[PDB]
Amino acid sequence: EGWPEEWYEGVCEIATKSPLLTFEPLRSVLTPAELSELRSTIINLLDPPPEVSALINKLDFAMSTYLLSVYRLEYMRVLRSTDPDRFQVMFCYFEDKAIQKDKMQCVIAVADKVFDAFLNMMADKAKTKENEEELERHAQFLLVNFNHIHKRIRRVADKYLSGLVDKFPHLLWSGTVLKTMLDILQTLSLSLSADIHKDQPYYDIPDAPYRITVPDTYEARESIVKDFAARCGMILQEAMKWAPTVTKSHLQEYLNKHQNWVSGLSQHTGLAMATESILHDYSNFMASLNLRNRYAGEVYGMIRFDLNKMMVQDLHSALDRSHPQHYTQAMFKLTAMLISSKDCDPQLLHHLCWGPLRMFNEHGMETALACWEWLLAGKDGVEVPFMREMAGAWHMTVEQKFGLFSAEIKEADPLAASEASQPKPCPPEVTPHYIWIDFLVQRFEIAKYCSSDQVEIFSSLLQRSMSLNIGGAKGSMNRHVAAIGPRFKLLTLGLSLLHADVVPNATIRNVLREKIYSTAFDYFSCPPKFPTQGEKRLREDISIMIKFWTAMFSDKKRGSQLHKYYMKRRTLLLSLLATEIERLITWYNPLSAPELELDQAGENSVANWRSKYISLSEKQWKDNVNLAWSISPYLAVQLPARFKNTEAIGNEVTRLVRLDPGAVSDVPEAIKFLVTWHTIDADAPELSHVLCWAPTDP
Amino acid sequence: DYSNFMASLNLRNRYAGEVYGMIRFDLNKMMVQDLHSALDRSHPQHYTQAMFKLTAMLISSKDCDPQLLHHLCWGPLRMFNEHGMETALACWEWLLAGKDGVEVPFMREMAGAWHMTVEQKFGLFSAEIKEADPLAASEASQPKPCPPEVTP
C-alpha cells in the first residue's frame, strides 16, 4: 500500500475472503541480481536468526515468491479480518505433509511476526466484556495444543502461551482456564494406565470440542504427563501469590461438581491436585465449603414440590426477633435459591443487599460477606447490578450516620467532674467498616484490570463520602482517636485509585485530590489524646499510618500556581503525619524493647524527614503559621500543641489572634493567647472584649 | 489418594441436607418406590441417589424400622455389579459410623444376604461350563475362553 487508491481497498477486501495457499510433490509442481535483491528484502522484513537466513540463501525464485505471497496475504487478512478465529488459521499451515518434507523454519518465522502483530492490535481494542471471552478462548486453544505429537509445535505453543500470559496478567485468576487445565490433566492421567496394547489412543475433553492423541510407548506417556504436571503447579502458586480469595473461591466452586463425586471413588487426580495445592488457616475453607454444599442441598430438597414469600418472611421474622442462627440460615437459603434460577428477580437481590442494615454487628457482617462472596463466585453476568445495590446501601449508611459517620459526644473533664457525672471513656465502635473497606479494596483491585464500568461506581462512591468542610463540628466523619484505621485506609484506597491512571480527564482529579487533602487536614483540628483500644488492634493502625505516609510521599505529579499550591500542603501534611506516627509508636511500648519491632523500611525515611524538618531555621518557619491560618484558624490554634522546639510559633499565633480574636471562640486554649496583652507590663487596655468567650475550668 | 475422602464427605453432607429439606413437610413409601423403580429400570444414578437418601433417612430416626434395614441390605442383590457394590459399601460404612448400637442386627441381615447369594450360585459359587477342545471342534463351535467374572 503505497495508482488508484481504491484498488488497495479492493485488495484488502479480496484478502478478507481469499482461501489458503494450500497444496503431491511441492517443488516439482512449481538473473542472480534480482534473486539477491529479493533475498535481501525477505531477510530485512523477517529479521530471522542467522541460521534461518543461511537456509534462505539457498532458494530459487518460486519458493521466495510463494513465501512473500503467504506473508502478504496472511498479514493483510489478520489485520483487516473479522473472523473470531484470527490467529489459529496459521496453525493449519503446519498440518500439511508436503511442507514437512521440503528441505518449517520460514513458516514459524513469519508466524511469529503475524502473532506479534495480532497481539499488538488486540492490546488496545477496548475494555468491554466479550474481549475477555475471546482472550479466554484463545488461551484455551493455546492450552490444549501444548502437548502436540510433533516437537516444534509444542515448543512454539509454549512460547506463545508464555507471551500471552505475561502480557495479560488477569488471565491467571480466570474462572474458565483452571477448569480446562484440570480436565486435561485428568484425561492425561486416565490415559496413563490404559493397557498399552489396546486400540484407539484418541481421547475426548468434556464441555469443549477437542481431542487428544497420545504416543505408544509407556516412557513417552509418563514423560509427557510429568512435563505437563509442572506448569499447572507453577501458575497455581503464582495465582495464589497475588489474589488468594478469588482463586480460593473458584477452587471451592469447582470441588462441588456433582459429576466428579461418583468417579471420586476412583483415582481422579484433578481433585487431588486441587486439594494438595490449596493446602500446600484451613478452617474457614472447609466451613464455607460445607455450609455451601449443605444449604444448596436443603434448597434443592425444598424445591421438589411463587416461593420467595416464605424465605422473605423467615428473614423478616429472624431480624425482628434478633436470632443470629435463624438469620444465617435464612440468608444462606436465600442466596442458594437466588443462585439457582433463570432470572435476576430484583427484589431478592435488594433484600439480600439491605439485610445486614437492620443488624449491624460483626457476626451479621461476616455472614453477609460470605454470602456475597458465594453469590459473586457462583452466577455469571451479575456484577454491575450487585455493585449498584451495594453502593446504594453504603450511601444509605452514610446518610443515617451509623458507624464511622456517627455523631460526636463530648466527655467530662477531671478538673470539674466532682458532680455526680464521673469521667469515663466513651469511644465509638466501628468493626463492620473495617472489613467492608477490605472487601471494597480487593474488589476494586480486580475490577481495575478486569472491566471499565465499576470504576465509575467506585469514583461516585468515594466522591460522595468526603467533603471540603475542614472546620469546627462538621466533617462527615468522626474525629475520635479510636477510629483512625478506616479513615486512613479509605484515604489510601482513594490515593491508589488516583495513581492507577484510570480517570480520563483532568478536572475530576483536582476535586478528588482537594477532598483528600481537606479530610486529612480536618483530622488534625482537635487536642491530642491517647489511644484507648486494646494491645491488639493498635499495631495494624500504626502499619496503616506508615503505609499512607509512604503513599503520600511517593505522590509527585495555571500550572505554577497549582504546583506550589499542592507542594506546600504536601510538605505540611508529611510533617504532621511523621510527628503523629512518632508519638503513637512512642506510646506503643514504653521501653525500647528491640524484640518487639515493626516495619523497618519506612521508619528510616520517617526519621530522616524528622531530622530534615528539625534542621530548619527561624525563617521559613514563621510562614507555616501563615499558611495554616490561611487554611483554617483552628489548625493554627492547635499547631503549638504538637510540640515544635521554637518560641516563634507562640509569638506569631499571639499576633494573629490579637489582630482579630472573633474568629476563634473555642474555650479552653484559645483565650490564653489573648488574655495576656502583657504579663506584667500592665498597659494597653483595648480590644479586650472577653464577654463573648465560653466558660473554662475553675 | 485423597479423592475418596472429599467425595464421601461431600456426598454425605449433600444428601443429609436433601433429606432434612424433604422431611420439613408416613414417608418411607415413596423412597421404597423410588428404589424399586430404579432397580427395575436399571439406572445407576437413581440407584445411588435412592440408596443415599434411604441411609440418610435411617440414620436420623428413633427406631430401627426393620423393613428399611432389610431393603438396604437386600438391595444390591438385584444389581450385582462393581458399581452397586461400591455404593453399598460406602452406605454401609456411613451407617456403621453414624448410628449407635446397630451393629448386631445389621450383621445378622448381611450374613443372611450373603447366605442367600451362596445358595443361589451367583458368582464364585456359580456352576461350571465345559469349554470346547481344539482337536475335534473344527465346526461352528470355535474354541473361545469363557472365564467367570467375580469382582464383587
UniProtKB/Swiss-Prot annotation, chain B:
Protein family: Belongs to the PI3/PI4-kinase family. Type III PI4K subfamily.
Q: Which gene encodes it?
A: PI4KA
Protein's organism: Homo sapiens
Where is it expressed, tissue-wise? Expressed ubiquitously. Highest levels in placenta and brain. Little or no expression in lung, liver, pancreas, testis or leukocytes.
Highest taxon of source = Eukaryota
Q: What is the effect of changing E18K?
A: In NEDSPLB; uncertain significance
Record disease entry = Neurodevelopmental disorder with spasticity, hypomyelinating leukodystrophy, and brain abnormalities: A severe autosomal recessive disorder characterized by global developmental delay with impaired intellectual development and poor or absent speech, axial hypotonia, and peripheral spasticity and hyperreflexia. Brain imaging shows hypomyelination with decreased white matter volume, cerebral and cerebellar atrophy, and thin corpus callosum. Polymicrogyria may be observed in rare cases. Gastrointestinal defects and immunodeficiency syndrome 2: A severe autosomal recessive disorder characterized by multiple intestinal atresia apparent soon after birth. Affected infants have a distended abdomen, bowel obstruction and do not pass meconium. There is some evidence of inflammatory bowel disease. Death occurs in the first weeks of life. Some patients may also have immunodeficiency.
Subunit note: Component of a phosphatidylinositol 4-kinase (PI4K) complex, composed of PI4KA, EFR3 (EFR3A or EFR3B), TTC7 (TTC7A or TTC7B) and HYCC (HYCC1 or HYCC2). Interacts with TMEM150A; regulating recruitment to the plasma membrane. Interacts with TTC7A.
- In the complete protein, the residues contained here run 1135 to 1294 of 2102
Which residues are recorded with the post-translational modification Phosphotyrosine? Y20
Question: What biological function has been recorded for the protein in this entry?
Answer: Acts on phosphatidylinositol (PtdIns) in the first committed step in the production of the second messenger inositol-1,4,5,-trisphosphate.
Lineage of the organism: Eukaryota, Metazoa, Chordata, Craniata, Vertebrata
User: What are the subcellular locations of this protein?
Assistant: Cytoplasm; Cell membrane
* Protein known as: Phosphatidylinositol 4-kinase alpha
